[PDB]
């Protein structure tokens, strides 16, 4: 429960990422997991080279699903070429919205 | 042949010092070593011999111009900073000086301790 999936996509797929949001989160709603934030940090420059690119498109997302929808997005990120890194987390708490992109501008 | 704004590479071991003048493309123009200046021994490892080989690389580099140099210093040995003072002695505008040093986070294990 209460995961904090953060994943970044390819800079050439940042146009297509709007359909990529609901394509993943609709399957979570099939499991029975509501989503408490969905932030899109945008196109930024990395600190180093990840498969010889330098821009990305960060996607922040906090999901509270059961053990099956976690098995979904664990596999779908591995079977993609848009997404280049991911990080699944776990907190034992709830989620408020609008963390830092106000302050990051 | 004319190139400008080259890059000077300095490799400094405990027993020898190798200096190479290149371009941004990473291509050899002039290399010069401490052993080629005729020291060959205990005199080879001195920071004085890293001035003789430094200027001698800086004389076959004026074949192509190279009025601007960018220095990468690499190695633990002596003559690590004496070679830089023997670069603009030949009259080269040194823009910036940069440490490059291979430091493994864990790495392979080194050889055993001497006795």
């Amino acid at each position: 429960r209460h995961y904090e999936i953060v994943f970044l996509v390819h800079p050439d797929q940042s146009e297509q990422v709007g359909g990529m949001v609901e394509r993943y989160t609709k399957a979570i709603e099939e499991d029975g997991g509501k989503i408490h934030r969905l932030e899109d940090w945008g196109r930024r420059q990395l600190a180093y080279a990840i498969n010889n690119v330098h821009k990305a498109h960060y996607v922040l997302m906090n999901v509270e699903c059961s053990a099956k929808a976690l098995a979904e997005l664990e596999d779908n990120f591995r079977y993609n070429d848009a997404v280049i890194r991911n990080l699944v987390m776990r907190r034992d708490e709830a989620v408020t919205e609008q963390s830092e992109m106000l302050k990051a501008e | 042949k004319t190139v400008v704004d080259g890059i000077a590479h300095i490799h400094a071991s405990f027993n020898n010092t190798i200096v190479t003048i290149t371009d941004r493309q990473g291509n050899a123009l002039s290399w010069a070593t401490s052993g080629g200046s005729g020291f060959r021994g205990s005199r080879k490892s001195t920071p004085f011999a890293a001035q003789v080989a430094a200027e001698r690389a800086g004389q076959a580099a004026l074949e192509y111009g190279l009025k601007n140099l960018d220095v990468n210093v690499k190695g633990p040995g002596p003559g690590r900073e004496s070679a830089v003072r023997a670069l603009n002695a030949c009259g080269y505008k040194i823009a910036s000086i940069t440490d490059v040093t291979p430091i493994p986070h864990n790495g392979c294990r080194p050889p055993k301790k001497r006795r």
Binding site: - | P76, E81, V84, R85, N88, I94, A95, S96, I97, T98, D99, T101, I103, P104, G107, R109, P110, P111, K112, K113, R114
Partner: protein, 62 residues
């Protein structure tokens, strides 16, 4: 990294910035492998040389 303005200033800004960063004593400890007991002697002798230094200075702080 040291940019550039006379030249003697940027040398001493580079000899010092390398040492204040490090990567010169660490290279010197990569040329012989210490077995982890011998790395527990550095952890033992340096802890004595710090807690005894906090007390020997108090004699100067009398």
């Amino acid at each position: 990294k040291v940019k550039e303005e006379p030249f003697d200033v940027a040398l001493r800004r580079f000899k010092r910035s390398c040492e204040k960063a490090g990567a010169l004593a660490e290279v010197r400890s990569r040329e012989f492998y210490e077995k982890p007991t011998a790395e527990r002697k550095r952890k033992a002798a340096a802890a004595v040389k710090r807690h005894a230094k906090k007390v020997q200075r108090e004699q100067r702080r009398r």
